[PDB]
A = this chain, B = another copy of it.
Amino acid sequence: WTGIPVFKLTEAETTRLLRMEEELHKRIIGQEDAVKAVSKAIRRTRAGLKDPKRPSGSFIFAGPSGVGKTELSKALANFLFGDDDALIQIDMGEFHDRFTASRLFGAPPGYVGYEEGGQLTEKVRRKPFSVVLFDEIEKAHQEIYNSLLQVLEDGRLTDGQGRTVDFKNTVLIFTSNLGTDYERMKQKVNDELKKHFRPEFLNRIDDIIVFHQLTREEIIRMVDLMISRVAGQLKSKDMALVLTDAAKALLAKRGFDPVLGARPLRRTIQREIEDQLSEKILFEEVGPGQVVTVDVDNWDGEGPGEDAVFTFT
């Protein structure tokens, strides 16, 4: 009826629940603490040992830019529901105007758009079990958090129409960017969160998670992850892509930076792999029925490699 997975735990489901850290790390390379906390929350919810009044979980993800904060929420939604559109993504970048908070709950009676109702409330009512992600919460004013103070503590939200919406079964994930070697970064982020947000709002959340920076090993694994997308894209055109280990190491070499996140690696793959591959595809250098073995020429693998060339066969 309600779509809430309250059943007897089958053996396959139980084994998948014990292994959810591995299944989340299938997509999220690194970020062990956040995956751990999300795993404990979901196991607590599915064990039946959960406080009925409070929601299933309430986290705030903080740290540098491009370290999987939205990716972890998307991966959690992909685990729970099987596809990423089931994630209720409501973004606080649209709420710089204090007047826009009505979009969360609705217009009061006697005003235009009263019959339609809110955006968050109706989407939560349609799917009582969902992962609700508030992106970039630092950007909205402190008024919008006052509407969420009730759902963080008692799991109820009153819309304009007067009906009560239950947030008891939803996982609420905030993603902020305050603050931006690990321990001082964690302390700075926690102090920034204390300064920016009221303590009465930071007490109602289950966990404050600081995302660690990306280093060489997780960036060289992300090389594999984000070239898998291009490989799957080429599989639709009767084409296959393979990288030599030199290609993987060179892509990881030009895409690693600690003062930024994971996006320069995507730019390196877009400019060094996808652009020349697109040029070769349109010039019919390689087409359907052929594989592309991308290699590195004029390089040794140890130096920085300012002059290595990507070769396509």
Contacts and interface: CB of A to CB of B under 8 A. Distances in A.
Interface of A: 9, 14, 17-18, 40, 43-44, 46-49, 51, 65-66, 70, 89, 91, 93-94, 96-103, 105-116, 118-119, 135-136, 139, 143, 146-150, 153-154, 158, 160, 162, 177, 180, 198-200, 203-204, 206, 229-230, 233, 236-237, 260-261, 263-264, 267, 270-271, 274-275, 277-279, 281-283
A145 to B, nearest CB: 9
Given A96-B101, A113-B114, A180 B158 contact: no
Contacts of A237: 48
Contact of A116 (B89, B101, B109): B109
Those 6 A-B pairs whose CB atoms lie nearest each other, nearest first: A107-B110, A109-B113, A110-B111, A96-B143, A107-B109, A47-B278
Contacts of A108: 97, 99-103, 107, 110
Contacts of A180: 199
B203 A260 contact: yes
16 contacts: A43-B279, A44-B274, A65-B200, A94-B150, A96-B101, A96-B147, A99-B102, A99-B107, A100-B160, A103-B109, A111-B112, A119-B162, A135-B150, A136-B146, A136-B149, A177-B198
Contacts of A43: 275, 278-279, 282
Question: Interface centre among A119, A177, A204, A264, by most B CB within 10 Å?
Answer: A119
Nearest to A277: B49
Given A66-B203, A103-B109, A93 B260 contact: no
Contacts of A91: 150, 158
Nearest to A226: B51
Nearest to A273: B49
Contact of A283 (B18, B162, B279): B18
Nearest to A259: B199
